[PDB]
Amino acid sequence: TSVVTAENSSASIATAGIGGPPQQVDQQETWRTNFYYNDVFTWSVADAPGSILYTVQHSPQNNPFTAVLSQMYAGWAGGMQFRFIVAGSGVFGGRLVAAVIPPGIEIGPGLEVRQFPHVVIDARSLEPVTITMPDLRPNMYHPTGDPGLVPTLVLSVYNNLINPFGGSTSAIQVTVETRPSEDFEFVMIRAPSSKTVDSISPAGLLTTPVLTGVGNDNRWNGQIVGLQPVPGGFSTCNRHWNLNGSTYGWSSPRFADIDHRRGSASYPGNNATNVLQFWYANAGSAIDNPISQVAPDGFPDMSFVPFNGPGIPAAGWVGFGAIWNSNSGAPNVTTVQAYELGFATGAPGNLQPTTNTSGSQTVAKSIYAVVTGTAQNPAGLFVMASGVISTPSANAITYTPQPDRIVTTPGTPAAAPVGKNTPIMFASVVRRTGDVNATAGSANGTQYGTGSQPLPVTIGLSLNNYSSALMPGQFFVWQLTFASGFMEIGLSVDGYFYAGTGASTTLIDLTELIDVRPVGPRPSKSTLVFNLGG
Amino acid sequence: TSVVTAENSSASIATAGIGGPPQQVDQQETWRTNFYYNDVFTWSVADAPGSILYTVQHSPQNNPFTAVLSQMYAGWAGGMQFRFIVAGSGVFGGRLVAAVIPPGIEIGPGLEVRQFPHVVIDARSLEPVTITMPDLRPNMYHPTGDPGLVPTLVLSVYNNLINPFGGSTSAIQVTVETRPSEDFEFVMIRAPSSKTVDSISPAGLLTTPVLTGVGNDNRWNGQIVGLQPVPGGFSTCNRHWNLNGSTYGWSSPRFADIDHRRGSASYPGNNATNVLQFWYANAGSAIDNPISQVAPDGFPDMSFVPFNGPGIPAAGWVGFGAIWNSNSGAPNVTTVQAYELGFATGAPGNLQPTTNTSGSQTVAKSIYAVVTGTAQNPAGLFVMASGVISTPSANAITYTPQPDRIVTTPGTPAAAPVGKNTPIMFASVVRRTGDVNATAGSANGTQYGTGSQPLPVTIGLSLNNYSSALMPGQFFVWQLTFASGFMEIGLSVDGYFYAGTGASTTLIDLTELIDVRPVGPRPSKSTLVFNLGG
């Protein structure tokens, strides 16, 4: 075998002797002789000449085996060899340029990689193309924890990609591989406790059994069976956490309980027998909720539908609950019922649905008859957190909610389709009131309820800060593999999830889904693949 | 590594010793061992066999690093190595021939490159094809400033390019790369003050922040947000500067002021209360303007629309201004109003719009009521240079101007679509009179006003002479790179800008535009690319 050493090799082990004798310097060790996978990027026909497709800074992490060895060593020095395995086709054309940009030069649109010392990679190349990144460093070694100035490896489009067919295929995958060079070394062994870049990548929170096993939504605690796209956009802010340590809304991530103490109660009719109890409060009276004052913790963020009489309302959010008096509260025995909660205006007269939370008032009307009706001014509610959907007859209404019924607070980031990508929404089979036995079989299509993001993701995002873990303008992409196809699923800086379905409103079933796999950050201009089983 | 020396190598350093010892002659210097980018040309399927695609004369400039080193050296001698990296495809066919034509032979259509000593370059070649241009010179060295007779490198079509598909892709990009040969040298070090070809290429005047940042039009001082093509052609001559140091029109490039002293004034009606003041002068009475006598400096070159009564006219050019008496002028206090200016015939009776400036008369009619109306024969105007567009109601009329309303002087060069290319026109969002709050958001589409060329280009072209900087029959091409595509934009010998959209009238938005890049001269038969985001 032949392992290529760097140009600055003899002065690299010489000046890194301030760390003592070099460690893991044995050239017959396999982890130093073989190339191993590092990354995959995508080269589309929409890429301009001169545009940068791949960028990596010099670091052991670029190799899977020097990233393992760097957690026991407090320092490194030496180069790294990169290989480029274009998937390609013999009908595609266009070249790439790869050059090692020295420290002190910007990496941006104005950079002319073609006038650096470079290597050229064809779109139809069989053998992989190799370049060596030396360790052109001003520090004498890079301590793992603050490495210093490093060279950068930049792939740029030389000639733009052409496909002389037309549609269908428009992007080529290029696989980066990585081997240490002959003068790479480690110094100053440390305890494996912890160190290195002191941040967490957003990769391990979304694993395999989150979609084909356990895993729940943000609205009901239902098992995820589908992703359904929406074209045009939607907004959710209840249990939706963005990539920083913040949210815009109430409802801490737990389906426990809804409890409110102060608010008015009423019932219609002159007779206090077999009526519908109606409870109301304004927005901003929730003193007990430490996150947001606009609602009690666990209140559903849907718009109230105006219904009257004995008719069961279509769609909506009902939950089992009771009303309790204040002053060391013991609830009334003769009122426990299913209640539909929501947001209205003009209570208790002409009730209209509301879109914005400001200027709205929370309402709670019973759907079934109750033999007693109270009207005391201090009163509250106690409603379980998990809910069901009220329906007039069986059949199947629609997936609930629609994108227009979902209430938003002021200052909320909205999902927008960028390119051919479109946002998705996670579906779950939920029980209903028109048919309790809604097993997923025959007797009409079962009801689907859709939340924004998976809860495991909400729990694992709430604690950690990811302000630099994903570079804005891109999304982190996972690779779902079914039994007869595969798909790419993205995750932006706002917590939204993307798939490149385009203008389609068809539910995608995770029945035959097997495994997922991290890839990394990838820009929003690249279309996520849709090679499904169909 | 191996660097190939020339055939006339031993007699090249020998006869260039009249300059003394050779400089930058060190073969281990990287700038002499690596190939670097020089140019890109395009090989279309419309190219005949024998037709010349690429031509370069022998010069250090052909290399990015000997062009840097030539500004400190007053002389050079030796060869240069060229490489040809065809982007290609495995489905394309056809060959090229590259030969070094000696001095004293013409470079034209009758030249048979295939019977010179040549190299053959396939359309589907993976490895680059190398040729060496020796320094076959009659002078003993080439002083930078007057080099003398040089050999020329000519690429010609051997077999014409075939695509056995049909449409879509019809052109291949070929990338020229360049390395100095072993006997290249510099002599007689000079001060870096300045020298070399003593002219400026038209490349640095159109840079990145001219389109996604600062940058204004020739009609209003509005920020450029779009390019819109027109099929059929248009003519503009007001602040439109061609590639020489000349123009055909008035209005020096500055939005300062419009001031005219002599000309007649009138108002209709027997009552001198709440009338529309109307001022007129003939074409050719502007003594104060040193460029052209046909107009005052800053007068808008649009055709007057005939309107009467209290109706606000559709389209047009209005500006805020007042009338002033002569003989050490102090203006009248009781007449300051918005005025619509323009060109008419048959004033003050039957007013008709005019196309040609000869035989026309400049008119200036108020659109709003004014409590005093003068009729003195010596009177003038003072109108601000920046203008707005008068509109009856809100909505959106059209982009203004249309190609037919624009007045031309006699002797004006007209834009014509050549091939599939078509001319473009730079758009800007301008304020209107029907809606002052024309922020680019909701409440109908905002009004777009279109000028001919960017002002930075007018300022940077006015001073310098470019009579040989662009070879006629071609255009200089820049490479715009968006977030999801790219485009080629040309610039001819007449100041017009071209894009290869074809027969389309759709506005192209520079919202996602990032960077531009110079390429060079490219002929008019080559279609500029349109790989946009759609």
From Swiss-Prot, chains A, B:
It comes from the Viruses. It is found in: Virion; Host cytoplasm. Transmembrane segments: none annotated. Coiled coil: none annotated. Homomultimer. Interacts with host type II histo-blood group structures antigens at the surface of target cells. Capsid protein VP60 self assembles to form an icosahedral capsid with a T=3 symmetry, about 35 nm in diameter, and consisting of 180 capsid proteins. A smaller form of capsid with a diameter of 23 nm might be capsid proteins assembled as icosahedron with T=1 symmetry. The capsid encapsulate VP2 proteins and genomic or subgenomic RNA. Attaches virion to target cells by binding histo-blood group antigens, inducing endocytosis of the viral particle. Acidification of the endosome induces conformational change of capsid protein thereby injecting virus genomic RNA into host cytoplasm. This is Capsid protein VP60.
